Write a sequence for this structure.
RNA sequence: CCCGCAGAAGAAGCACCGGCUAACUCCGUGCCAGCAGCCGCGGUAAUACGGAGGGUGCAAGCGUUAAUCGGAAUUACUGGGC
RNA sequence: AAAUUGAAGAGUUUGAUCAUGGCUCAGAUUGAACGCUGGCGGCAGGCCUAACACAUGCAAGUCGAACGGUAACAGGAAGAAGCUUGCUUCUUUGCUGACGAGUGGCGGACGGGUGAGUAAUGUCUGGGAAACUGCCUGAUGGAGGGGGAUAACUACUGGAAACGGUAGCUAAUACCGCAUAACGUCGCAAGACCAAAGAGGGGGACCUUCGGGCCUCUUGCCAUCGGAUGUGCCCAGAUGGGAUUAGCUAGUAGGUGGGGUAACGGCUCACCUAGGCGACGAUCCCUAGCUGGUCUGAGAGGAUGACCAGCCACACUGGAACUGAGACACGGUCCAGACUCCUACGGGAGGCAGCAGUGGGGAAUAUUGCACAAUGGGCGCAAGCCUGAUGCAGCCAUGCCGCGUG
């Protein structure tokens, strides 16, 4: 299952933008971010250590749209691999098809990218893959079908992705509406707002 | 007994239909029983002269169970009551053996028999099993049984 | 007697046969002396279809073993290939 | 029994049984006679009994009624005894 | 070439038979303290040449007798 | 396994919110009815009982119980004392 | 290159403190059960309790190329008879294809099920000598000649039945002699002894009674030494609790001689010795199928043996033996016991812990399904037949896993 409910409430709880909206309007014009949801959202209670670790984990999980068990499997796989586990799991989450195809600029929201994917609108290496949680390999080539190449939402997506910051390990051609995922990033290319240590100490109890 | 029989089309829905029917029936029967019990517990505070006889009944067919229970319950009198604990169709099994052994009752087999499992508990327990094959003799003996309790 | 027979492995609608030297009196998946190779009637063209150790086959046949039909046809096909 | 083959097998097993009984009976009769001669002490009679017995064990072992080793043991022990006598 | 074990005589009372203790010295599984265990065996000897207090050499053989499956090879040192 | 048809159209519940332990306010009773893993709530100011609004965690599942190990260095060889 | 990178605490005794010490909670996991709720798909799993008792259907056959044979169906033949003169009843013929019953060969000792029993009669590991083994394979040879029975069948004849009894009654790779006998057996040697079976396919010439002889090919049978495989036997170590279970043992421990087994052995008997085991735990009582592994744990460890695979034991309970290469035998035989059923009361029949399924017990666990298309197994030269093994399907949120409800 997925989270089908209101979206800005997640940001309000977490206290920071999660990019769960298109961006046509600034987030502040839509909601009062500083106040937490609920009637008692004005108050700011104490948050214990376990609380802050849980909040960090929840932030990551909500930002990448993953349910609990899948996240547990990701953590286990990262622990099994070599190197710093935070780096590996960050690579793992970014290896999903939804995050990549959104990051290539073919959609407005990760939800929109996932809805495109589940409807057999994309190929990798010329093979149609509808499974959202598919993991991509380096030098793989991603493209959209000609059948759904006419979608106006994709067209506007190709434009609104422009004002965002563009990645370094990816190459995208709006001319052929396709992309190449040259190599997997490390921790460095991602936001410093993500504290992996709290997640590590949380799960490793 | 007497329920209407119909052929149905599909498989999965029949189980749910039957279970839904069972739930409401259970609800209603428990409702009547506990309504009576709650209403009349404190009314039962007074006492009087009453002769109660408890029986547990095993009969061969459904209609036979109905008939025997009906006869015994209609035979009840204001001061002489034949309160059947519970009856069912089939053989006399350990549930009936330990049920009759628990309460002050008797196992009566009408055109049915006992089984080894109930048999062991009965011989260890000294519970009384009464065997009859004719309705008339059964009524006669039970009538004697209740009429002997008086005074 | 000892014979070379096919033992089924894998999953439903996904057969994978081991090539086994075993007593005929044991079950299909029962005890056996030596595993020799494998066959896969489903594998795609980009993957090896079959593999057998021919030397051991020769050794056991010389010892006195016997061959089933499918195994015999398999040896015929592999000898044709190489 | 229940199966046809079971009945037929029992029927023929009975026959095999009485035939084996007869042949084994002859076998023991002969060994008893040679043992009695051995206890008697007459070397000529002992040798004669040994020679009339000798073909019989070999024939019966040939047909499989008694394994070869049992006949060999019997003959070897009996000749050992006859040499004990003389 | 023949596997052979060396042991101490403890019983020459039996006719054409002797009893020998084989002492083995091994560690404990979990505690690690080295213990000294013993095995008693019945050995066949044909001239009753052994004596109590000797130390001898024995080897495996067919079941020459019940509870008698080892045979004397050579008397290593004598008692007294 | 593939292609076509129509329509957002045929499809979300469970437990918890006094501390341990992530998440609070009012109404109804008044050591009663009740809760409870432990400390312990309830005698008219109940974030602990019942209802409601809000929130937290899981999800085609959610809880309770049964059972083994861990926490237990609480049988201590690694690793306890008189 | 690679095949490990592993370790958290909190509440609770007192006016307050430190310590000691018990209790409770946070995590994983299950053959799970119950409550509320419930869309799809993929893989797996599903009587843990009464080794309680079972209705019914199926679960072990095959070979006419071993044999006497026609019980059925078909083809041919005389032409029976008919007869529309070239179409159809009965008139038959083992004549042909085949094949009910029967003898004979191989197989039911494998595959499947269960864990009642066993503290070793088991298992795990590493060694060992005194053993056998059908079907498979290597070598050397052999394969001459006879004899008397029986089923089937025929005619009778008991019993309620199960099942019988008598007489005639025919053959074979069924049975039994004789010849021949070494590299086999026994024996120091000398010596003495031991076996058998044919069938089918095709055919020139020749014999020829066309009975087939005769030629050739294939496959069967006998003996002996080998290989591969299975099984039997022995040794050391390891394999629960109870010392409020301290002594146990007289074929018992040895030895000589007979006997027995495929094999060694108190395996069995006669006699002689007086021994043997036990605090390094005997004997006795309770409990228990074992292992490769599974769960947990940082590790050492603890608990456990559902599924898969190897080993053991059991088939209503107790006892015994035959047949057989191999059993002291789930769907074989005999005896005793209980229980269920049939009866003319004179006597008889039965064994799901095999696949479905029923009753009962329990908190709790399913379809009286399709097919031999594939793997594997038995029989055959082969075609082929059999297979509730196995392949696939049906029911169940029991679990892992992926997807949607925009
Ligand atoms: K019988
Ligand atoms: K002959
Ligand atoms: K919907
Ligand atoms: Mg899921
Ligand atoms: Mg097996
Ligand atoms: Mg024979
Ligand atoms: Mg050592
Ligand atoms: Mg909090
Ligand atoms: Mg509550
Ligand atoms: Mg207090
Ligand atoms: Mg109030
Ligand atoms: Mg309330
Ligand atoms: Mg609420
Ligand atoms: Mg620990
Ligand atoms: Mg510990
Ligand atoms: Mg202490
Ligand atoms: Mg699909
Ligand atoms: Mg014929
Ligand atoms: Mg005819
Ligand atoms: Mg036939
Ligand atoms: Mg059998
Ligand atoms: Mg069972
Ligand atoms: Mg060994
Ligand atoms: Mg006669
Ligand atoms: Mg004749
Ligand atoms: Mg013969
Ligand atoms: Mg000679
Ligand atoms: Mg001869
Ligand atoms: Mg154990
Ligand atoms: Mg004696
Ligand atoms: Mg002797
Ligand atoms: Mg047991
Ligand atoms: Mg681990
Ligand atoms: Mg361990
Ligand atoms: Mg088991
Ligand atoms: Mg039974
Ligand atoms: Mg028995
Ligand atoms: Mg035999
Ligand atoms: Mg047995
Ligand atoms: Mg059976
Ligand atoms: Mg009987
Ligand atoms: Mg069954
Ligand atoms: Mg029940
Ligand atoms: Mg086949
Ligand atoms: Mg059949
Ligand atoms: Mg499902």
């Amino acid at each position: 299952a997925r989270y089908l409910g209101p979206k800005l409430k997640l940001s309000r709880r977490e206290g920071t933008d999660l990019f769960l909206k298109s961006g046509v309007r600034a987030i502040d014009t839509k909601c009062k971010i500083e106040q937490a949801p609920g009637q008692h959202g004005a108050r700011k209670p104490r948050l214990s250590d376990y609380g802050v670790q849980l909040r960090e984990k929840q932030k990551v999980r909500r930002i990448y749209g993953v349910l609990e068990r899948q996240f547990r499997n990701y953590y286990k796989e990262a622990a099994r691999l070599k190197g710093n586990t935070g780096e590996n799991l960050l690579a793992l989450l970014e290896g999903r098809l939804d995050n990549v195809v959104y990051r290539m600029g073919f959609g407005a929201t990760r939800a929109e990218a996932r809805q495109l994917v589940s409807h057999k609108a994309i190929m990798v290496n010329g093979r149609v893959v509808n499974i959202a949680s598919y993991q991509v390999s380096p030098n793989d080539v991603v493209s959209i079908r000609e059948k759904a190449k006419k979608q106006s939402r994709v067209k506007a997506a190709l434009e609104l992705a422009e004002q965002r910051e563009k990645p370094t390990w990816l190459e995208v051609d709006a001319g052929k509406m396709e992309g190449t995922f040259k190599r997997k990033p490390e921790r460095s290319d991602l936001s410093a707002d993500i504290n992996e240590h709290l997640i590590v100490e949380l799960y490793s109890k | 007994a007497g329920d209407e029989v119909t052929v149905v089309r599909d498989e999965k829905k029949a189980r749910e239909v039957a279970l839904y029917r069972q739930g409401k029936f259970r609800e209603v029967k428990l409702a009547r029983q506990q309504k009576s019990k709650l209403e009349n517990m404190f009314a039962n505070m007074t006492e009087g002269e009453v002769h109660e006889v408890n029986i547990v009944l095993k009969a061969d067919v459904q209609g036979s169970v109905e008939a025997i229970s009906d006869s015994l319950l209609k035979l009840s009198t204001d001061e002489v009551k034949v309160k059947i604990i519970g009856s069912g169709v089939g053989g006399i099994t350990e549930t009936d053996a330990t049920l009759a052994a628990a309460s002050n009752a008797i196992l009566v087999g009408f055109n049915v028999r006992a089984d080894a499992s109930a048999r062991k508990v009965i011989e260890a327990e000294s519970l009384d099993l009464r065997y009859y094959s004719v309705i008339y003799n059964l009524i006669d003996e039970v009538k004697a049984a209740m009429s002997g309790m008086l005074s | 007697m000892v014979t070379i027979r096919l033992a089924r492995h894998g999953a439903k609608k996904r057969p994978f046969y081991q090539v086994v030297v075993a007593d005929s009196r044991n079950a299909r998946n029962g005890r056996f002396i030596e595993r020799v190779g494998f066959f896969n009637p489903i594998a795609s063209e980009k993957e090896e279809g079959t593999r057998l150790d021919l030397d051991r086959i020769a050794h056991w046949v010389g010892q006195g073993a016997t061959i089933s039909d499918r195994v015999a046809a398999l040896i015929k096909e592999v000898n044709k290939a190489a | 029994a229940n199966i046809k083959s079971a009945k037929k097998r029992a029927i023929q097993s009975e026959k095999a049984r009485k035939h084996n009984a007869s042949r084994r009976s002859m076998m023991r009769t002969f060994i008893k006679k040679v043992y009695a001669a051995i206890e008697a002490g007459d070397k000529a009679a002992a040798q004669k009994a040994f020679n009339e017995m000798q073909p019989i064990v070999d024939r019966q072992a040939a047909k499989g009624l008694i394994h070869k080793n049992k006949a060999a043991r019997h003959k070897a022990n009996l000749t050992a005894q006859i040499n004990k006598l003389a | 070439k023949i596997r052979t074990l060396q042991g101490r005589v403890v019983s020459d009372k039996m006719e054409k038979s002797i009893v020998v203790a084989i002492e083995r010295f091994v560690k404990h599984p979990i505690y690690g303290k080295f213990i000294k265990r013993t095995t008693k065996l019945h050995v066949h000897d044909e001239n009753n040449e052994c004596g109590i207090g000797d130390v001898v050499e024995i080897r495996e053989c067919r079941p020459l007798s019940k509870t008698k499956s080892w045979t004397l090879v050579r008397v290593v040192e004598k008692a007294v």
Q: What stands out?
A: The radius of gyration of chain C is 13 Å. Strands of chain C lie at 2-11, 14-23, 34-39, 50-51, 66-67. The longest helix of chain C spans residues 69-81. Chains C and D do not touch (no CB pair under 8 Å).
